[PDB]
Symmetry: D2
Subunit: 500 residues, 4 copies
């Protein structure tokens, strides 16, 4: 069973529209064929995607809502639930549209063209327009000799001058390639004072909150305030169950990492922007340190971006991509992510299968090479003392499965944190807790009836483990619970049981 | 609470006879005053003696039986039970009696006198007679240039010749001192073929077995056969509950240590004879190795002899004696022993108090200096997996007490083996199991009613812990049990509970 | 900060100026090689931290290889820095043939139906791809219907759907969009092609490279120790016993025989391209970490190769997965990282070396916190190795700027580099072959000096050479090792802790 | 097998022949000292492995101490082996006075009622025990009814049951059977007697010992660093700056001030006799293990003292608890073990040294499995210490028979001994004071050689001296350290691994 969780970004790549697969003739012209689209998504779920990411940097509310509805059907086709993660636009910058029939342009090194700060206009081959977050004027934030990078740094522009008359940057193209709509723009070493939380994000979140989501990934978290602002909307709408993963993708994020970890439910290591906003060679340092610190706090860490990039276009990943996924698992990540690979490319299913195969192989080598060390943790509560004793039992003998009966998931989270040498079946009593545990390392969430004071929870643990196919006659399992139901304050009991 | 157990050898020193304390006028003339004697022994028990040793090398069956009866009353005065250990005479050699009014003689270096092998005779100042085990003739086992040592090596005799006409050794006294009745005699490097089990021992054991004992310490164990021979008598008389501690006190013992450990319930490190029979400087090597190997086998190790020797005559031990007791605890001994100190000297109570004080102080330093390492053990059974998880819980947080509900003591023994940072209250259901656990490190045995299938054993654990004074409101305890009673095959459950 | 992790850069047309024309400008191939301008490009890769150039004999002919090696010799004079020369053999491999009309390549679409010829000694057309099989073997009876023929490190899959006995051709379906170029690696998993012990082509390539002057041979598709021994025999026979053999592990037989291969070789190149097609792709990170640990424990060189900065063939910045792979290869314990297409065939060869150098330099500073190699586990099996252990201890006890070894053959420098001290290793040696021969050992800065006389102060020399190299300044503490005295010492026998004046 | 753990033996009458009479034969005291025959006895204790003799100034007068030191100087010439000379001061202590009629002692029974005088300058009778109080202090107002007066390391307890203001005498009850002898330690726990900073008696004893020629002073009852500094000032003032100070820790103030005492001293003597009465007896093993670890971490000497083989005062074999205590002191990390009554006052002084030597030699072979000291934890705070660490590493990497240090002051030998290498340390030094001054450092075999000239081969000398000492034979590997070259080197800067010819 795959212990490392997969976040798969959804998009047009899986969506059959009017009988036409993605990238064909008048595709964006046809309307979405829900049942067929849903069968594709079901196939991602069966292949090991544990959560779908809906990126609010691409698509009106209508595209998102319909995609979100397609997954709901997909869960019913697959007969398996997934988490629903919403990724915010956040304080970012993109490339608007081009005048005439143009979608892009060919540029050459030493070529001198223009970038506009004038918000809400159009792009010309000699005048690229910047769509900024909340239409801010960045003209007085950017100095000559700064770099404007387009399509995740795929194309660089050197600010060689500034025209006060038009509020335009004069830029010399540094290398050859593509300029595109809603295509990221980084201007590193730039103190643009974006809001603690833009309105468009406020709006996107409430929309997502009303559709039903489990997780919010908050782009460009700079300070705890950015997390707390989103917490506020979550508690206010009565969605206090929603978990916030701070996306660390700049120096301010890294500088305030400790305070961001405390306010958040987890960290998405957003290496795309991080490797432009900070020295690319420091990203692997920050990755390892962030995984260690988030695991130490009992929270969720997702490693993101370029993990199987090549499988956008090809059926097999490069040796560096297989290495990167493998090493994320060894570093101790709870989850690995696909973006364009699953959302936008020709092999989304294959991307998920491939990531699953790598993650499953790497998990077999965590004993030998794993970087996380649970022996170093302070056990700060009686539930955590029990998670430690569970890890000990799984080290002392061959344990097929750990079962926790968990009201809110707290026990499953502390067991996960300790990385036992076993899968963790988390028996919970509502769908929100079940979906909320789907990014925790090793945790297999399962809905069951809330136990009565006359029920045998150890018999329920065994029978639900047998039903789910996770154990058979003669297997040894560790079950934890709060006994007796409705007298116990917390998980207080551990039972070693041989399956009948 | 004292975790290191004390074996106190009983003898005349505590026994008021006819109103006369030990060593006074016509003392051995008066007859034993049981109730007063029993009040003295009760005082040893309250001071921390956990088991009384009855040494069958001194005293007819009548002396032993009456002493054993005095302890039974002592337990009732003290309101605390102790174990009853019988120490066999074994394949040894002693010094008979002297012709005329003599009890001893003064000798000088270079002096040439005689030793007799002729069994069952009398001693003269020029002719010391050897009382041998089962009256064997050792004349053809001992070569010229061998050493005959008397009173635990306190006095040495060099065999300078052999007189065939009388079967006597001609010996030159090596140093000045005491020759005495039933006073040990070692002849190291001597292959005397004593029986696998002498008749006198066979008889002593059956006598002890009929009085009611928990433990047999078998002097001069050479091979597993010596243990198995005693096992046979124990099973045959329906006393299969009795535990056998092999006394390792010669090279053959050390050579077959692994096979002796397997057949035995434990090892008494009998340093008195061991330090004459093997190089004295090797005894501390063998002590540490034997403690490690016996702990690894889940069995009991007692360290014996000269531990507080000086307190035979003085109210305060030497700095080397305090060091020796302290270091036995750090090495990982389950128990420390007094012989002459409690049996024969002027300060038996003070000897017990002193050993208790040292043992209690040393226990506080086992985390820092302790030699035993439970992390290195293979967990070879599900009860042992649980003993490991208990040790983990006691390492992760402050645990006042571990409670085991144990039918035969097996769970208490495996918890003890792991040396948790807590006292171990062992709730058992018969006196034989209760007394049988009294030499296991950290174990506080307590008799209670066998639980019914409708009882709450976690409530019974808490209430018996509160009754015994070991815990109060707010303390955290770890309780293990086989649940449910009469369905569980073994200890299968661990509960962390805060006392009400 | 000196870069301790070594870089192998593959050379090809990408650095080469032809008639004033840069790589992939029109008529480029029309023009003659501008040697001086090409040597000037190559000098920049030496300055950016390429320690050894790779000459892949799977591509081009003797004339192109020989001219390229001569251009590098000029580049060393322009840079004032020497580099190693590494020859990469074809091995028991399959490559695509040249095409008729010297077309370089063709694009194919999923579902396209084409043929693969088995007849040796012919050229490909777009519709009939011909194979150069090592030993000129006929593979027709070795490949069944249903086998996959993969082209260029598995970039393009071809499914065998039928066999024509008349022409001994395979009828194949293109499984994915991509390119068949000339001289591209061809894999056919789960076949047993009886390749010869040593191909005649390999015998000739190695002998031609030995003639030009090389320091290293990377032997492709090492299956057993006999593949290493066959090349060793040629190096010894031609009086090139100083040439080091790196076995390329890139199939299951190589993995199966790793122990005897490491014993017979001077090092291992982890050839991940072929390895990740010949074995399960997800096993390659397991084999990588394990090979680095075993080769370092044997006191030998390990090179991690292929796809390390792949995206930089076309773009000026690498992907996050690529920077991760380079950084993790350093943490794993690699002596060296390698560039293939990035430096041979790409738009950014200089920037590829500069980027790798930057990642390698950053990763070395985290070896204390994260490094996998554990020198405390090693048996010190000789007195030089005991001294290597003591040097490591001295660099752990205090801030040592530099270790200096006066080394005749490089043995002391290899044993110090094995222990991965927390310092640069200045290897003072007395001949250029030993000097170039150390350029892929972790942390080693090889430098030529005069063999010291029995009346020289080797400790004074060590300090002066270090100061002249700009490695140390007054107040720096250095550790120096030497066999003292010269002419009496059997080995490195002396360690001196010295403060620079 | 060389004994690495050092032995201090206290000398007294037990080795001394008087008019052909051995110790405790009649009229023994009647006769004059047979110097040659006494020196011959003492030579046997040197041969059995006593590295330093202790001269306890609490017992006897200057004349007896001076004669005894002269007898030892003769013993060294007879044995052909040098030993250290250690003076033990009285300190701020109480001792029983001499008795009238020069009776040596009296026996008392539990319940016997006697008196203790506070008036200074008088002799004891059996019924009125007089005290020699350091500083000739009047202690009458310092001791309340209910205090315990303990005699001879707590062997005999006296309960104070009343006070007679007329005579300023204590009325006391004997609590247990035993002996009050002349010049015996007296403890009175939970009193605060204002002893002087340095007693005039101590000033005179130290100055008399410095005149005879000593290497070490063990300062009794060190309370603070000022007690060490007061003695240091006298050693420096008299031109005896080479004399080493071992602070005796034997009360709670000493334990409280341990850090500043270790800083000020050259070493610690763990004086367990007084310590185990002035603090809870059951704390002494805790303080012992902790003092050994702190003194070894400071690069200094620790001596474990008192009751180590107590039973061998009267008997030829020690108890099992006594052999355990010696063995465990070695495992704890002690540089040295000590004999008091066993060697000074007993029937078996030679056998006591032989027995300790045997236990010490056996225990050193188990330091690898059980040793408490951990040199991996230490900061290497100087370049000599870095070299000491590297020597240890070399003795862990391979079988080293011997470490040889050419040491002017012994500093390199102390730093090597601190790291407890798995080898004997041959310290080649150029003066007898340095030589005797190293005789209590763990593992150090001090040996006098000629200061080497700037043209000598110090590595050839090291090997020859080692071979002449019979420590090594051809084929043995040795590690040698030196400051090279002589006259230029600021410190030990060179390590050589060398195979004996
Ligand atoms: O778990 P293990 O070591 O196999 O032991 C199982 C045995 O121990 C017992 O559980 C006894 O344990 P207790 O005496 O502590 O109750 C037996 O019933 C059982 O057969
Ligand atoms: O935002 C992201 O997902 C990134 O930059 O990786
Ligand atoms: O037999 C004993 O008890 C001994 O020798 O210690
Ligand atoms: O040959 C190579 O370098 C490979 O396959 O990676
Ligand atoms: O003074 C001493 O040596 C002691 O008290 O142990
Ligand atoms: Mg290859
Ligand atoms: Mg003292």
């Amino acid at each position: 069973n795959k212990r490392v969780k997969i976040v798969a970004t959804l998009g047009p790549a899986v969506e059959i529209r009017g009988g036409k697969k993605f990238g064909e003739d008048g595709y964006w012209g046809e309307k979405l064929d829900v049942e067929a689209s849903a069968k594709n998504i079901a196939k991602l779920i069966e292949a090991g995607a544990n959560t779908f990411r809906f990126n609010f940097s691409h698509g009106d509310h209508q595209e998102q809502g319909e995609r979100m509805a397609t997954v709901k059907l997909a869960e019913k086709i697959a007969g398996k639930k997934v988490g629903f993660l919403l990724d915010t636009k956040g304080p970012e910058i993109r490339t608007e549209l081009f005048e005439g029939e143009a979608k892009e342009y060919s540029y050459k090194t030493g070529e001198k063209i223009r970038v506009a700060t004038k918000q809400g206009i159009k792009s010309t081959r000699e005048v690229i327009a910047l769509n900024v977050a909340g239409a801010l004027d960045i003209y007085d934030d950017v100095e000559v000799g700064r770099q404007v990078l387009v399509d995740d740094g795929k194309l660089g522009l050197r600010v060689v001058a500034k025209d006060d008359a038009t509020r335009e940057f004069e830029v010399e193209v540094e290398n050859d390639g593509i300029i595109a709509k809603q295509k990221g723009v980084n201007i590193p070493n730039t103190k643009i004072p974006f809001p603690a939380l833009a309105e468009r994000d406020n709006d996107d979140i409430r929309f997502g909150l009303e559709q039903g989501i489990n997780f919010i990934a908050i782009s460009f978290v700079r300070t705890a305030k950015d997390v707390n602002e989103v917490r506020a909307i979550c508690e206010e709408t009565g969605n206090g169950h929603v978990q916030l993963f701070a996306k660390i993708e700049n120096q301010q994020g890294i500088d305030n990492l400790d305070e961001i970890i405390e306010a958040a439910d987890g960290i998405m290591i957003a290496r795309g922007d991080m490797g432009i906003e900070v020295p690319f060679e420091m990203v692997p340092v920050y990755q390892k340190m962030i995984i260690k610190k988030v695991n130490a706090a009992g929270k969720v860490v997702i490693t993101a971006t370029n993990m199987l990039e090549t499988m956008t276009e090809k059926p097999r990943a490069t040796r560096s991509e297989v290495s990167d996924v493998f090493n994320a698992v060894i570093d101790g990540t709870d989850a690995t992510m696909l973006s364009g690979e699953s959302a936008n490319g020709k092999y989304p299913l294959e991307s998920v299968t491939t990531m699953a195969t790598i993650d499953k192989n790497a998990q077999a080598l965590l004993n030998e090479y794993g970087r996380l060390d649970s022996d170093s943790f302070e056990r700060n509560s009686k539930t955590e003392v029990m998670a430690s004793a569970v890890k000990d039992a799984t080290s002392s003998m061959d344990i097929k499965l750990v079962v926790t009966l968990t009201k809110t998931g707290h026990t499953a989270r502390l067991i996960s944190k300790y990385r036992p040498n076993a899968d963790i079946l988390a028996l919970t009593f509502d769908e929100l807790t079940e979906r909320g545990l789907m990014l925790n390392w090793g945790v297999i969430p399962m809905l069951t009836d809330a136990p009565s004071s006359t029920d045998d929870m150890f018999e329920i643990a065994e029978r639900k483990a047998v039903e789910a196919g996770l154990v058979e006659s003669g297997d040894d399992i560790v079950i934890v619970a709060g006994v007796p139901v409705g007298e116990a304050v917390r998980t207080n009991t551990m039972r070693i049981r041989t399956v009948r």
